[PDB]
Design a protein around this ligand. Structure first.
Ligand code: GSH
Ligand code: GSH
Lengths: 212, 202
């Protein structure tokens, strides 16, 4: 059984976990804190980042885009990445847009946890918030009046966007993306109820589902 | 004619330019300084980053991985990304490894240019250097005694690795990766002679 190294908070890890659930691929979720000085992540991912997927023979796969792509090939349940042409490139670009929103939001989390108050840069903070604001505008423009980001069914584009919006709710709740973008609010209401999203909420890090 | 927005220094841009040269795809290179406060990059890329490809219809594509993949489908010259199977995943992972080395090296550049001396973190700098060191080790182990990263022909894996090693020469010239990794030194001596690399130096 493959092992996915990650954390409950990590939105790149969540993207992979959602893909694995949609694809009905069995895996073992292995919790790791990459920010701990005693982390073992570099024994598996040379970049020291999560998610990292480890196979039965010890082979390791990264990053989240590579893992998600690989996972779509492992099962016939759903087709999360179109095989070719225009729809595929669109789905890949949507994933990059969502991942870039995540890159900016995660940069903000790093500015909080990895810098002392005296080291923090207001210009860097502004820059990342500008990226989030503009990424949200593009997501709203791209989705328009449609049910899904691309074509007529859930793809990796929707999964990625869903994880990004959820990550804003979790770490950046002051960004009122729902008020700014009605179509994203509606989109998220539709995607958040999927079992794959319900089972992978970052808020599950607080151990709530271990209570009797 | 498609426009590629980027800079000469940007290694993610260079990866795309080498791909476009290898695919013999015609394009116009448009220079932009994304770090400048008055940059216009957000008109085309919501993420405010380069590279960004603007097609004839006005459609914008990003990031470098997406652009490289799209470019491979546009032209029948070379086969940079395998169609399926183990070979494709291997090539995608090689690109991620090289892009991750870039991410760390670019973070080190950003630490110096976007932060004042009082804002810089030595623990963060150490962390990014550790990633570069470990990425180089993984690239050396992955390549072993082979000529190409994957299969027996030029792929996006070779291109991405070449761009990463060259970016270390450019911005981290004190990192003596050749001494530590003879196979990467030999690899780079081969790849830097390709016209695609010769014409895209930072
Ligand atoms: N490009 C990566 C990004 C992964 C990433 O930055 N993950 C964070 C945790 S959410 C991390 O492991 N950072 C640790 C570090 O950079 O040292 C992906 O898409 O998987
Ligand atoms: N994931 C992107 C990274 C691109 C990137 O971060 N490029 C740098 C220039 S080398 C940039 O535009 N940084 C500007 C910013 O983050 O504001 C890719 O692979 O193309």
């Amino acid at each position: 059984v493959m092992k996915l190294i990650g954390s409950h908070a990590s939105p790149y890890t969540r993207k992979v976990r959602v893909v694995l659930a949609e694809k009905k691929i069995d895996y073992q979720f292995v919790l790791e804190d990459v920010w701990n000085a005693d982390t073992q992540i570099h024994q598996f991912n040379p970049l020291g980042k999560v998610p990292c997927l480890v196979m039965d023979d010890g082979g390791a796969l990264f990053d989240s885009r590579v893992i998600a792509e690989y996972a779509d090939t492992l099962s016939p349940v759903a087709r999360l990445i179109p095989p070719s042409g225009r729809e595929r490139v669109e789905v890949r670009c949507w994933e990059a847009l969502a991942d870039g929103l995540l890159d900016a939001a995660v940069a903000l989390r790093v500015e909080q946890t990895q810098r002392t108050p005296e080291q923090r840069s207001e210009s860097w903070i502004t820059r990342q918030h500008h990226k989030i604001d503009e990424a949200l505008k593009a997501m709203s423009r791209g989705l328009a009046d449609r049910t899904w980001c691309n074509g007529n069914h859930l793809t990796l584009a929707d999964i990625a966007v869903g994880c990004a919006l959820a990550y804003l709710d979790f770490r950046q709740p002051q960004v009122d993306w729902r008020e700014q973008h009605a179509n994203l609010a509606a989109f998220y209401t539709r995607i958040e109820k999927r079992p794959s999203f319900l089972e992978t909420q970052p808020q599950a890090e607080n151990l709530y589902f271990q209570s009797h």
